Amino acid sequence: NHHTYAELMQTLRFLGLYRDEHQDFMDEQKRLKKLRGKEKPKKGEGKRA
Amino acid sequence: KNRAARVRVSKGDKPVTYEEAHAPHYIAHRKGWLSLHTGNLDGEDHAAERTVEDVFLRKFMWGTFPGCLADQLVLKRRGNQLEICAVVLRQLSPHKYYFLVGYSETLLSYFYKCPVRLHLQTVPSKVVYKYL
Amino acid sequence: SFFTKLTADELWKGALAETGAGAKKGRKKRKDLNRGQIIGEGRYGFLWPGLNVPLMKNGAVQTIAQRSKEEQEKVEADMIQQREEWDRKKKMKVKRERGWSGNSWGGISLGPPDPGPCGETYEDFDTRILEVRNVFTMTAKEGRKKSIRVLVAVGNGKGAAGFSI
Amino acid sequence: HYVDWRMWRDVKRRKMAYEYADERLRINSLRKNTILPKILQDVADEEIAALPRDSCPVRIRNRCVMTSRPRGVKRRWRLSRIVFRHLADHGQLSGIQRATW
Amino acid sequence: VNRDTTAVPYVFQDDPYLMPASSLESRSFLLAKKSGENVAKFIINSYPKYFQKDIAEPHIPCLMPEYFEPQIKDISEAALKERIELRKVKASVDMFDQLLQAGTTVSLETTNSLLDLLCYYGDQEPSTDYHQFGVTWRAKNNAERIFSLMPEKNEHSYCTMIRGMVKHRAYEQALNLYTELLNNRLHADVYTFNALIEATVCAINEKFEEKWSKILELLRHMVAQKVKPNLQTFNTILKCLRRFHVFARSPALQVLREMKAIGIEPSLATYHHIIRLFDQPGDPLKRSSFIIYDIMNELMGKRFSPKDPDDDKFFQSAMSICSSLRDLELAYQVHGLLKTGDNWKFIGPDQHRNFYYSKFFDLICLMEQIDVTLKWYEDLIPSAYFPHSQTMIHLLQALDVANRLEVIPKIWKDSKEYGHTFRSDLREEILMLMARDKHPPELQVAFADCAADIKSAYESQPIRQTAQDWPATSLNCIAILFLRAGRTQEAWKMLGLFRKHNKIPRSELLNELMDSAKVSNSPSQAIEVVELASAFSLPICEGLTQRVMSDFAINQEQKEALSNLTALT
Amino acid sequence: LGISIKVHEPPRKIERFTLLQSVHIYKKHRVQYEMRTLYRCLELEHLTGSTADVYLEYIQRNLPEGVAMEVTKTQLEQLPEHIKEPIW
Amino acid sequence: PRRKALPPRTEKMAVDQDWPSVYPVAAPFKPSAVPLPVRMGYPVKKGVPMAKEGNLELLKIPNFLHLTPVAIKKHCEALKDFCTEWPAALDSDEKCEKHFPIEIDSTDYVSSGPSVRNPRARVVVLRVKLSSLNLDDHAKKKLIKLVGERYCKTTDVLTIKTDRCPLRRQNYDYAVYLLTVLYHESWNTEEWEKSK
Amino acid sequence: ETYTEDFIKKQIEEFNIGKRHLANMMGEDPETFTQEDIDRAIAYLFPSGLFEKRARPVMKHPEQIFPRQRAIQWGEDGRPFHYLFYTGKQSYYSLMHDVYGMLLNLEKHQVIGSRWLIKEELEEMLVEKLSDLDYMQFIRLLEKLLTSQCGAAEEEFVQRFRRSVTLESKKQLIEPVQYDEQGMAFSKSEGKRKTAKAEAIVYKHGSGRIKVNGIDYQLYFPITQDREQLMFPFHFVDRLGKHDVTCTVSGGGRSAQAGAIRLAMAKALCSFVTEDEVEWMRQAGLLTTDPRVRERKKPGQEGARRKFTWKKR
RNA sequence: GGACCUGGCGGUGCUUCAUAUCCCUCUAGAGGAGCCUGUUCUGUAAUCGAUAAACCCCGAUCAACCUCACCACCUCUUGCUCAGCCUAUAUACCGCCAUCUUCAGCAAACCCUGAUGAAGGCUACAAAGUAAGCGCAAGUACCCACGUAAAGACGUUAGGUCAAGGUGUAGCCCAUGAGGUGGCAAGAAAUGGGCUACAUUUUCUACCCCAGAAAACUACGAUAGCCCUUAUGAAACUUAAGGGUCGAAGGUGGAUUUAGC
Ligand SMILES: [K+]
Ligand SMILES: [K+]
Ligand SMILES: [K+]
Ligand SMILES: [K+]
Ligand SMILES: [K+]
Ligand SMILES: [K+]
Ligand SMILES: [Mg+2]
Ligand SMILES: [Mg+2]
Ligand SMILES: [Mg+2]
Ligand SMILES: [Mg+2]
Ligand SMILES: [Mg+2]
Ligand SMILES: [Mg+2]
Ligand SMILES: [Mg+2]
Ligand SMILES: [Mg+2]
Ligand SMILES: [Mg+2]
Ligand SMILES: [Mg+2]
Ligand SMILES: [Mg+2]
Ligand SMILES: [Mg+2]
Ligand SMILES: [Mg+2]
Ligand SMILES: [Mg+2]
Ligand SMILES: [Mg+2]
Ligand SMILES: [Mg+2]
Ligand SMILES: [Mg+2]
Ligand SMILES: [Mg+2]
Ligand SMILES: [Mg+2]
Ligand SMILES: [Mg+2]
């Protein structure tokens, strides 16, 4: 059950009991992309409108 | 050239443990297995289920004791008991180790519906077998 | 999926691309993301007795508690400030005493020679660079190989001086 | 949170195949014999053909449970050859070793 | 298998870094582990859907999530009974009010089951994972409100109200309610009388004769209503007479003989209350002697079962008297009774277990031979308990009386391993014994290795945040031990510490420093001794200067130096 | 415990299989793996049910990790009462 | 100051101690509790096998420290009270066959995991020699034709294997039922048998 | 990893204490506890199936574990002890100097079971690293010392460098001669050829009858070549029609079974011929087990040696 | 521009070699026929990748639907996911590998030579080299000490794979994402590998080796075509098996070329 494993470990990370190195890596990459101007658009407000 | 599970030669400054220093062709010759169960014996079942559980336990412990594990886990199964033997460092305070032991043993017992135990052996530093 | 995630070392080794054909014949920096993280601290702001908060308080064992929304905002904001300061220090550049010109090695001091094995010392000697040259040699396999040739001079300012390549 | 959309489609196929297994079995038994009248067997053919497509077990695919690779899978461990080797070559699969003889 | 004496209790992680090194860590390490288990259970019960995949065969009910929420959302009797089983005091009262306002009938058995919940917790919500002095029975509470609105009231209704009042220290109300039960021609149970006996004593403060007359009236009432007393009826009497002490000594023994005759078997709690009653501050030889001697002849070789909540307090009380009487033969009988069968599980919590062994071992060190004392020392510590710093001092005093001082270096090694490295009273005790008298060269060298390690403890204290403090006796002892061991170089260096901390040097230290100088024939050092004693204006200095003049050759500079100290003279 | 026991070693079994070595193409390059199953047979004779329950519980609890057991028990029974004679 | 680890408790052990008390049950190898200078590991050039502290290879081994010859002999002394005595009259296999002509075979499977289930455990095998049954000439001839390959003429043993029921007690009761209906039908004579 | 003498002295103290602990665990007398008992106890307590024995648990005396290290070569004053120190090969050249000096004194005065030690053995007597040419020079100088009229003093020295090259005897082992119920002498032996395994019983006296699995040999082996193999042993020693044989063979094909029977009968027949005749049978290849067995197929090729066709380019 | 150093290259010299190995020699083949299968071309509204040695029954230990990533049409928009993308870039990469390797070399730290230039460093009756470590070796697996496996460094081909999975950079977000229905996957032709044959050392039957028949237009020869039945499946002209019918090319294969001690 991939839903159970992913959801459980996501909850434990928000509870501060599990350190997800991979998720921390993804968060840092996404943070630096905002500062670089490459942010995800809002649904319906894409470059094509 | 083969790559699988080979720490490649460097300038002589890379410390490697005994397990990391042996390529796959030394399994059963100079190094043992990191998990022992009956699933892979002839005529035995549930090898697939034991494998998924092992992969999860290794990721769980890695993120539950961040920066503490000094070596790979040794997973042992006898009957319906699950023993987890880990070699950890001596940086965290003992109180936090006791909290994480009580927490992880209880959480894993309810997750896999079996009595789980965690045996910790502390070392002052990562045991170095050689410098590649 | 939880089973497709990898460790930080694996993720940095791939993203940095320090190894590869592009870095062999002249054909991004790592960041430790576990640096300022405290075991037990999470987004929900729970206070786990014995892990991220003291086990006993006023001689009694604490119970599971959770920081208020306002109190957790301060912790998050304080962690971002701690991150900027740590990063700011790295951007700070040291003031170099330039040599003959701004980008040249000539004239720059290298400090005293290293102390010998038998407790021998050379604190009285200063070292100066006179030339730095990138020499290239052709090899059968790798082709154009890059090396460094340096000329330095040493002296104690009292008549004893020498040079070496 | 499954590996990809293709694994998610196979998850749903295995779920629907499990729910209709008894019904399909009973209808198929009416078709797999020479005892019942043809008039009754022709009606059973139409009945099982009207069941949802994703209830048919031949549409289930044994994919790698960690990477969703549809081929090169070892049934005993339900892992693709690549993932299996990664675990085996690190000594994490009990009793499995390189073979030389 | 028997207990492993080299190991700590099995609950701790068997690892030199994770093993508790003191009685404080022995308590906190277990609380940290229990805290981690509570956090795991909090998560399991908060997110039960993650822990519902059951792969175990046979099924393990004790490894499934728990559901503390009511699942019946209809307003009816069957829905109220669910909130009573879950012990939802507030929801059950609300469900009861709404159910009552609607006009639907609520059975009597269910109304009683609601009083049992309110009367027990006092209209307060029990403790949960996460969402002393004084009376806790509020005037207007849901229990009394529901009790008055109650249409039909039976015996069980009054009983659960009387027991709830006494439990929450509303002794005066419980007695008033017991009068109504009698006026209504009802009969209470033994459990209701047990609470009334506790109220009769704790309601008002009076003399013993007045209280003892009311209790004997309840007991005679209990016989008129054909109610048989149980163990708790007599244990409550003995536990309530602890106030009067001497006045209740003979009456308390009448309760004990009353149990034996009726057929009720005294439990460990029955003798605990008799032990504490006779164990009043004073001279225990008059009575407490033969009371514990007769209680042990009765309990000899008996296996006990849990009958009363206070059964885990006897051994702590029995051992406390053995130390007061200073009777070691009696202490072995108490410890012998603790070792028969499974009696070892009645020793009590950790605080009671450490108190039991502290008194037991401190009595061994005092009254037992040293060869046997060191066998108990190895069997009990750390396997049974971690010693208090005062237990290590009682052990050193036993080695001194036995003339076995070669063990002192071992007691210091063990003291550090038990968390007593920075105890002032302990380091002073060790140094004084080692430096009390002179010993052969072999032993004198061993004491210098220990004094050197103790010196390191004074230097690297955690109080180092504060200015280092060196007791006067410690400095005089550490210095004398270096001289007697031949480490003169180390002794002369320490003389500066006497001036730094301004600590008076001992007369014996100054005299032995001279002997070390006359051996080395160093006049400067000899003057440095006279210079030190001169700073403190000791009378032996003036006489010592005369000794220095005759013993050592005095250079003109040295002679003028002594003249300068003679000028001070 | 006073149980008559014999021991022998049945022939081992080695299961082998082959896998590709590269993630892509390079068909003629494989890696081969194997699983070795070794056996040991303890044969006990003439023991009651109570003795068998104690011995089996003692050695089954002490079964090392990675070792499975298949215990075949041959029980002695008497003829059912209905079979001792023909009906007619 | 940081926490200093205590010295290993092997330094406190006597050479004449009761070892079974140290390792009473199966437990992983603990360097600080095993007073043996044991080493393990393929050594490097001009090196030695790695010491026991932090040695993962010694941790992988299923050790027998809890099953020393001294411990086994003490364990078995306490387990004698649970055993019963085999009948002395049953001295040989031929004597067991005389008094107990039926043999019932069943198998239990011990594996590692959370589930103790194993579908192979339901199988029951019943063996009996026709010489032990009260069969005349006609009945024994008819019984051999009914069972077919379940009978072996060389050994004269009838083997009935049952495994169509979920449980083993059901397959056992069914095996006894089969032996009963086979015995009573062999003694029954039909009219169509005259056409043999 | 340098090891001082104080470190080895501590390792020996631990081994003696641990040796008494191990004897206490196994319930044996600590005084008579030998190294063989230690190895047996360690194998039981720490069972390891690793194929390489050097990687298994071990508890040996420190002198047998740590490598022999050369002591200090100079004192506190810095003066080397040996007068050949500055050559860097004092042990080797000290030996060449002594051998050269003996060859001089002789001038002033005037094989099968042994071999010269190999270079790696000489590097252990000297505790130094040697070159291949350094080893040849030393051997050439010892051989020059044997050719001379070396005395007893010059003979004990050369033997220090001769190692025993024990030559195992090729003499065939003779099977015992047994007797059956009727008192007829016979011998028994076995033979293997490919996957065929045979066991033959050769009677001392007979008429030349051969039974294979209870069948006459010409009925069991209808192919003439197979019968020629059964004739080879008896005909080579001139004993056709003098013995009766009963053999059993299983596995393999017809020719492999005839080969296994040939080897089994030849071995059993050695009990009824003279020692010289047994050596002739050995030199005729009649007593050797044929080691030629099928070779496995390798992955990525068609057969054991056959490769796939190198595709046309 | 002059003179050198290193590497590469030479239809460059001498000397010695390759042990299934470059040539001849030995054995069976490929190249000619049919069929199976991959690829290229062509075709189609209708994937992708490999593609000299080192691609071509290769990713696939495998595609009727599914698989699937393709095409047509229709549908959904916080969407199985604190979204998603088999979108681009293997010339940003990890991971796993090909190749020389059917090799024996790689190399930190030093020392010395060349006037302290790029650079170079051996001669054993020895003349400046010492070298940890890595590889070879040794050990181990299989039936030996043999053989076969396994192993095989540093580097070479920006070699292969973003479509195992992960991932840097860039890009899409009512669509480059998600779902449903139906559909393509053919053969003018060329070519690689394989299978079956051309027969008498053969064909058929009995038997597993002492036999009887067959033997050129009813012989040898299709696993092809056509028809039928059966098996699996919800679904089969389509996939497999069996039977019937049918009885073709092929009569031993040029240049060239593969494998084996
Ligand atoms: K050139
Ligand atoms: K790559
Ligand atoms: K990829
Ligand atoms: K990418
Ligand atoms: K071809
Ligand atoms: K051809
Ligand atoms: Mg390869
Ligand atoms: Mg500038
Ligand atoms: Mg399929
Ligand atoms: Mg072949
Ligand atoms: Mg062709
Ligand atoms: Mg294509
Ligand atoms: Mg392409
Ligand atoms: Mg490409
Ligand atoms: Mg479709
Ligand atoms: Mg399709
Ligand atoms: Mg797409
Ligand atoms: Mg590339
Ligand atoms: Mg070999
Ligand atoms: Mg190979
Ligand atoms: Mg090798
Ligand atoms: Mg490329
Ligand atoms: Mg799309
Ligand atoms: Mg024909
Ligand atoms: Mg056909
Ligand atoms: Mg069908």
UniProtKB/Swiss-Prot annotation, chain A:
Protein's cellular compartments: Mitochondrion
Compositionally biased residues, Basic residues: 31-41
Biased composition (Basic and acidic residues): 42-49
Region described as Disordered: spans on this chain: 29-49
Cleaved signal peptide residues: none
Subunit structure as annotated in this protein's UniProt entry: Component of the mitochondrial small ribosomal subunit (mt-SSU). Mature mammalian 55S mitochondrial ribosomes consist of a small (28S) and a large (39S) subunit. The 28S small subunit contains a 12S ribosomal RNA (12S mt-rRNA) and 30 different proteins. The 39S large subunit contains a 16S rRNA (16S mt-rRNA), a copy of mitochondrial valine transfer RNA (mt-tRNA(Val)), which plays an integral structural role, and 52 different proteins.
Similarity field: Belongs to the mitochondrion-specific ribosomal protein mS33 family.
Listed name of the protein: Small ribosomal subunit protein mS33
Species the sequence originates in: Homo sapiens
Boundaries of the shown chain within the full protein: 54 to 102 of 106
Curated annotation (Swiss-Prot), chain D:
GO terms (BP aspect): mitochondrial translation; translation
Compartments in which it is found: Mitochondrion
Keyword tags: Disease variant, Mitochondrion, Primary mitochondrial disease, Ribonucleoprotein, Ribosomal protein
Residues shown, of full length: 28 to 128 of 128
A GO CC term attached to the entry: mitochondrial small ribosomal subunit
Keyword Thylakoid: no
Assembly notes: Component of the mitochondrial small ribosomal subunit (mt-SSU). Mature mammalian 55S mitochondrial ribosomes consist of a small (28S) and a large (39S) subunit. The 28S small subunit contains a 12S ribosomal RNA (12S mt-rRNA) and 30 different proteins. The 39S large subunit contains a 16S rRNA (16S mt-rRNA), a copy of mitochondrial valine transfer RNA (mt-tRNA(Val)), which plays an integral structural role, and 52 different proteins. Interacts with LIAT1.
GO molecular function: RNA binding; structural constituent of ribosome
Reported disease: Combined oxidative phosphorylation deficiency 38: An autosomal recessive disorder due to mitochondrial dysfunction and characterized by perinatal hypertrophic cardiomyopathy, growth retardation, muscle hypotonia, elevated lactate, dysmorphy and intellectual disability.
Native species: Homo sapiens
Protein name: Small ribosomal subunit protein uS14m
Family classification: Belongs to the universal ribosomal protein uS14 family.
Swiss-Prot record, chain E:
GO MF entries: ribosomal small subunit binding; RNA binding; rRNA binding
Record InterPro entries: Pentatricopeptide_rpt, PTCD3, Rib_mS39_PPR, TPR-like_helical_dom_sf
Entry-linked Gene3D superfamilies: Tetratricopeptide repeat domain (1.25.40.10)
Post-translational modification N6-acetyllysine, affected residues: K49
A single GO cellular-component term on record: cytosol
Keyword Glycoprotein: no
Major subcellular location class: mitochondrion
Pfam families in alphabetical order: PPR_3, Rib_mS39_PPR
Superkingdom of source: Eukaryota
Keywords recorded for this protein, A-Z: Acetylation, Mitochondrion, Primary mitochondrial disease, Repeat, Ribonucleoprotein, Ribosomal protein, RNA-binding, rRNA-binding, Transit peptide, Translation regulation
Tissue: Abundant in testes, skeletal muscle and heart tissue.
GO biological process, one term: regulation of translation
UniProt repeat feature PPR, residue ranges: 72-106, 107-131, 154-188, 189-229, 230-266, 267-308, 311-345, 353-387, 388-422, 471-505
Location(s) in or outside the cell: Mitochondrion
Similarity comment: family membership: Belongs to the mitochondrion-specific ribosomal protein mS39 family.
Complex and partners: Component of the mitochondrial small ribosomal subunit (mt-SSU). Mature mammalian 55S mitochondrial ribosomes consist of a small (28S) and a large (39S) subunit. The 28S small subunit contains a 12S ribosomal RNA (12S mt-rRNA) and 30 different proteins. The 39S large subunit contains a 16S rRNA (16S mt-rRNA), a copy of mitochondrial valine transfer RNA (mt-tRNA(Val)), which plays an integral structural role, and 52 different proteins. Associated with the 12S mitochondrial rRNA (12S mt-rRNA).
Function: Mitochondrial RNA-binding protein that has a role in mitochondrial translation.
Protein name, as recorded: Small ribosomal subunit protein mS39
From Swiss-Prot, chain G:
Organism, scientific name: Homo sapiens (Human)
UniProt protein name: Small ribosomal subunit protein mS35
Subunit structure: Component of the mitochondrial small ribosomal subunit (mt-SSU). Mature mammalian 55S mitochondrial ribosomes consist of a small (28S) and a large (39S) subunit. The 28S small subunit contains a 12S ribosomal RNA (12S mt-rRNA) and 30 different proteins. The 39S large subunit contains a 16S rRNA (16S mt-rRNA), a copy of mitochondrial valine transfer RNA (mt-tRNA(Val)), which plays an integral structural role, and 52 different proteins.
Any GO BP: mitochondrial translation
Keywords in alphabetical order: Coiled coil, Mitochondrion, Ribonucleoprotein, Ribosomal protein, Transit peptide
Subcellular location: Mitochondrion
Assigned protein family: Belongs to the mitochondrion-specific ribosomal protein mS35 family.
A single MF term (Gene Ontology): structural constituent of ribosome
Upper lineage: Eukaryota, Metazoa, Chordata, Craniata, Vertebrata
GO cellular component, one term: mitochondrion
